[PDB]
Design a protein around this motif. Structure first.
Motif, PDB file in Angstrom:
ATOM      1  N   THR A  78       0.827  -1.203   0.000  1.00  0.00           N
ATOM      2  CA  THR A  78       0.000   0.000   0.000  1.00  0.00           C
ATOM      3  C   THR A  78       0.862   1.254   0.000  1.00  0.00           C
ATOM      4  OG1 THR A  78      -1.678  -1.221   1.247  1.00  0.00           O
ATOM      5  CG2 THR A  78      -1.886   1.177   1.154  1.00  0.00           C
ATOM      6  N   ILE A 134      -2.861   4.012  -5.302  1.00  0.00           N
ATOM      7  CA  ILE A 134      -4.293   3.950  -5.046  1.00  0.00           C
ATOM      8  C   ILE A 134      -4.626   4.750  -3.792  1.00  0.00           C
ATOM      9  CG2 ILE A 134      -3.943   1.767  -3.843  1.00  0.00           C
ATOM     10  CD1 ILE A 134      -6.698   0.949  -4.741  1.00  0.00           C
ATOM     11  N   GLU A 135      -5.791   5.395  -3.798  1.00  0.00           N
ATOM     12  CA  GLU A 135      -6.192   6.300  -2.732  1.00  0.00           C
ATOM     13  C   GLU A 135      -7.378   5.739  -1.955  1.00  0.00           C
ATOM     14  OE1 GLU A 135      -6.441  10.422  -4.012  1.00  0.00           O
ATOM     15  OE2 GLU A 135      -5.678   9.860  -5.993  1.00  0.00           O
ATOM     16  N   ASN A 136      -7.610   6.323  -0.779  1.00  0.00           N
ATOM     17  CA  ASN A 136      -8.686   5.892   0.113  1.00  0.00           C
ATOM     18  C   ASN A 136      -9.957   6.684  -0.205  1.00  0.00           C
ATOM     19  OD1 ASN A 136      -9.679   4.456   2.643  1.00  0.00           O
ATOM     20  ND2 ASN A 136      -9.863   6.598   3.290  1.00  0.00           N
ATOM     21  N   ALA A 185      -8.919  -1.968  -3.292  1.00  0.00           N
ATOM     22  CA  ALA A 185      -7.835  -2.190  -2.343  1.00  0.00           C
ATOM     23  C   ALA A 185      -8.248  -3.181  -1.263  1.00  0.00           C
ATOM     24  CB  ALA A 185      -7.408  -0.860  -1.721  1.00  0.00           C
TER      25      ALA A 185
END
Ligand SMILES: [Fe+3]
Ligand SMILES: [Fe+3]
Lengths: 569, 565
Positions: A68, A73-75, A497
């Motif tokens: 991560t 990639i984002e939250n 994710a």
């Protein structure tokens, strides 16, 4: 280190000790339920994971922290910007084997016989479902042939995956904060029918392969709102496959994985603890194949089927709907237990070893799961027979084993697993019946759970190949399809994710190995039986390597070195 | 559910029963060593973490995955682009309490008395160290006074943190691929001396006076920095904090909580029967201790582990410091009891001036820790009185004498400072031993373990390693200079991950065991202990209302029953 013995062959003092121990175990392994699923009330510390296990699992989770950290990639609940982004999700992880070739139709179809859920495909008999209006025109236009559907069905060439079991799902919901307000959105449910065909000529060689023919995304046909898509539909076909794969994912996790490996094993572990003494031959045979099973099922209770858990966030339906599907699968499996023995279940789908044509060859020659699983099933059957024959020489010992009779009675009771399809005539009376029962339990705990658990990373950790939920309706058949359309169908970044997270921790290591228990048998005879099981396992390993040399793609999940001894992850 | 009894008061059959159990335990709890540190050979499954523990730890790790997903920090050995970036590392995590005010000198100094490592500060007596050439001119310019150093030391106003213990560290290395090449870099170590003063004017508080980053003074390459130095002063604090971090993790945390408890757990298993009163007293305070020490062996002090990646020295050097700390602790066991340890640093309850006032009135760790120490002492005295009526029972307890002999043996812990006259002879000696063990396992490990997130998860306040040399005293200092001194992004992420994992939850609670005592009288002893803990909780809440900053880590509610995380 006590020699195992049947309870009717012990002295009264020994019997008193056995009943004492059994009572203590009953105090320790108490029955409980979560949402109508049989679990243990309090996990005994002796049934916890080991330190070794925890070290491995921790290595996996830390690897997810690092991966991560290296990822972009984002939250967020936004879709990805580009499809290519889905391939950049593994900077510090193995790349899933399906990633490069997942768009190819043969790779799509091969997952029916060698993917994570090789349990759905069935051979068409008589006719297609009447709600699946495939025509001779479609079949001829796709196969480039003059043959009809009726002739192909008569020759056993057509296969189908019907996902009607997902039709009554209530669509899952999700919500988040954007620009200071609460956005609420709903997942899209699909219950597709997929028609495949066996191609003996294959895609330009002498290797026969399964080929997808048609996909109807939902159950009730309608030419405008729910048409029948074919490979001639281009992008639409692609989208169709996505939904199909999504369906296959849900059935995989609810039915094939959670219900019919993890959860159906639980009543057997609990019955073993509640009715069998420690020195009972059956308990000593089965407990190696229960290691960490209660623990991992408690982890599933806490993290998977719980509110906010993995199944809540990732699957197509609401948590309630998913648990309904799980419970229905558990109930059907338990009601027809003996009918879910591997040979009978393969036969019932028309893809068993005995489903052959006039020439004597199987209608579905390419079925790695079937062949390898058959090897493991026969080996386990020989091992179980030779083991149990050391302690049961005549069936009257089966009938006079009070602990075994209470074992069966607990299993078939409503509060002990409701396994009403376990025995005939309401009692266990023969040795061979116990052989079949133990063979099926051991096969489920090891080979089956391996075959459904370990392809999860190679096929489901790359999100576009098998998303656990779709997040937009199937576009109209005549609409133009942009990249943004597909990106809105595929899961948003946060949930992708989460899916990668799950699939990585479920496949990161092997808690134990099939046929290699921690503590060997006190009985030297039994230990010899175990050794011959290991030798046969080596023979099977070599044969499967040989088969993998000539298969299209190697099938490594049922190699004995990759099969755990128990359902433990 | 067997009533506890001394081994010499049992029937011969019962005695052979205890010997049976003890033999079995000996095979299960076998002694081992990793790099000269005494550990267990194979962890008994009964000593593993529970399911509840695993659920909590997993919640923590998943929280780290989620916080990393929301962060902009990258998996690189580059420094951060902005200092402000260090404040953006907690999108889905609690903000560390020290983050906003860590630049303030008073917040810097108050970590000596209420931070993660309140075990270093000592009152200056007679004179400063001769390698720390602080002058009257410096002192007077900082304090804005005419008083001399000699007069301040005569009045007990000056305190010092001397990090000479880190002077012999071999600096750690790290390497990484960059454009197809292996870049290899070395950490910078420091062994600073820091002079503080008690300012009664100000609520009175500690105030930092001087910092010398290394041990051998030189006016050019190792000067004495003061708050008048501006940027350089700031940097001088960073290094100081780095020192305090290393000493914290090597000495105060790993060595003198986790690792010194191990020989006591193993001795309890190897020499005491299950129904022995001492085993029944201590085992609640050993819960998960063997397991967490195994996790430390696998993940903390292992190659590529946390101590390897984060600390100032090489893994070898850090392990050397750890072993020296363990050895000094065991050699002088009784002298590390809380009151004696505080007295030896001149900051005990008895270090008072002519007016009867303590030279260091603000010491929350000392006050709260004293409350807990006295409470535990009363608890174990009243407990052990139920089974030891006269000291002859101490002398004739064979399992207890084998317990001591195992502890002091060179292969069982080498606790040579555990007992006088080579034997355990009195009851009060055992009371002090058990008191100290329980205090270390709960209160002490709480006090050194749980401030770790609030002071060490925000990297600039306490970096576990510095990655550039101290700048020249005359050279200009940009933001990039500091960013190069502070850890790169990957290692800062690692430090945050460690601290969060160590502070996520409380595996148990002081005075609340899982299983009650089968002895009703013993349950009365424990109940009295719990009532006293409630009273102490109220007193500490009251004190926190009057302190400048609250000190919550020694509240009985927040203290575990064992060293378990
Ligand atoms: Fe699984
Ligand atoms: Fe700790």
């Amino acid at each position: 280190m006590v020699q195992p013995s049947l309870p009717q062959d012990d002295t009264p003092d020994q019997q008193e000790q056995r009943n004492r121990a059994i009572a203590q175990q009953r105090e320790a392994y108490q029955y409980s339920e979560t949402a109508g699923i049989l679990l243990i009330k309090t996990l005994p510390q002796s049934e916890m994971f080991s330190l070794k296990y925890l070290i491995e699992r921790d290595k996996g989770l830390v690897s997810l922290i690092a991966n991560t950290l290296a990822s972009n990639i984002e939250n967020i609940f936004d879709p990805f910007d580009k499809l290519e982004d889905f391939e950049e999700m593994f900077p510090l992880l193995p790349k899933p084997l399906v990633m490069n070739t997942f768009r190819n139709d043969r790779v799509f179809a091969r997952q029916r016989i060698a993917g994570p859920n090789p349990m759905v495909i069935e051979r068409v008999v008589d006719k297609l479902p009447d709600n699946f209006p495939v025509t001779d025109a479609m079949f001829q236009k796709i196969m480039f042939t003059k043959k009809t559907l009726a002739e192909a069905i008569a020759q056993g060439k057509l296969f189908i995956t019907n996902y009607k079991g997902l039709a009554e799902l209530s669509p899952g919901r999700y919500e988040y904060q954007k620009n200071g307000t609460l956005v609420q959105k709903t997942k899209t449910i699909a219950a597709p029918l997929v028609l495949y065909a066996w191609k003996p000529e294959g895609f330009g060689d002498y290797r026969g392969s399964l080929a997808p023919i048609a996909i109807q995304i939902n159950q009730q046909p309608d030419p405008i709102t729910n048409p029948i898509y074919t490979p001639r539909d281009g992008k639409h076909w692609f989208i169709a496959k996505i939904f199909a794969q999504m369906a296959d994912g849900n059935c995989h996790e609810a039915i094939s994985h959670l219900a019919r490996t993890h959860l159906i094993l639980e009543p057997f572990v609990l019955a073993t603890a509640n009715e069998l003494a420690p020195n009972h031959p059956l308990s000593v045979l089965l407990k190696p194949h229960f290691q960490f099973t209660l623990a991992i099922n408690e982890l599933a209770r806490e993290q998977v089927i719980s509110a906010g858990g993995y199944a809540d966030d990732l699957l197509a339906g609401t948590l309630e709907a998913s648990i309904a599907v799980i419970k229905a699968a558990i109930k059907e499996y338990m009601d027809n237990f003996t009918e879910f023995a591997l040979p009978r279940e393969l036969a019932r789908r028309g893809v068993g070893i005995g489903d052959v044509d006039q020439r004597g060859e199987n209608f579905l020659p390419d079925y790695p799961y079937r062949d390898d699983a058959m090897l493991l099933w026969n080996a386990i059957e020989v091992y179980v027979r030779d083991y149990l024959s050391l302690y049961y020489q005549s069936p009257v010992q089966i009938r006079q084993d009070t602990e075994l009779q209470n074992w069966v009675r607990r299993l078939v009771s409503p509060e002990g697993g409701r396994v009403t399809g376990l025995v005939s005539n309401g009692e266990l009376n023969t040795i061979e019946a116990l052989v079949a029962i133990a063979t099926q339990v051991i096969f489920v705990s090891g080979p089956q759970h391996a075959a459904v658990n370990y392809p999860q990373y190679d096929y489901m950790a790359f999100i576009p190949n098998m998303p656990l939920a779709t997040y937009a309706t199937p576009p109209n058949k005549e609409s133009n399809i942009s990249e943004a359309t597909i990106l809105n169908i595929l899961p948003p970044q946060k949930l992708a994710a989460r899916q990668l997270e799950l699939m990585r921790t479920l496949c990161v290591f092997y808690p134990n190995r099939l046929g290699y228990p921690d503590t060997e048998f006190v009985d030297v005879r039994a230990q010899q039986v175990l050794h011959q099981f290991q030798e046969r396992l080596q023979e099977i390993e070599q044969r499967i390597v040989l088969c993998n040399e000539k298969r299209l793609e190697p099938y490594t999940y049922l190699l004995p070195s990759n099969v755990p001894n128990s359902t433990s992850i």
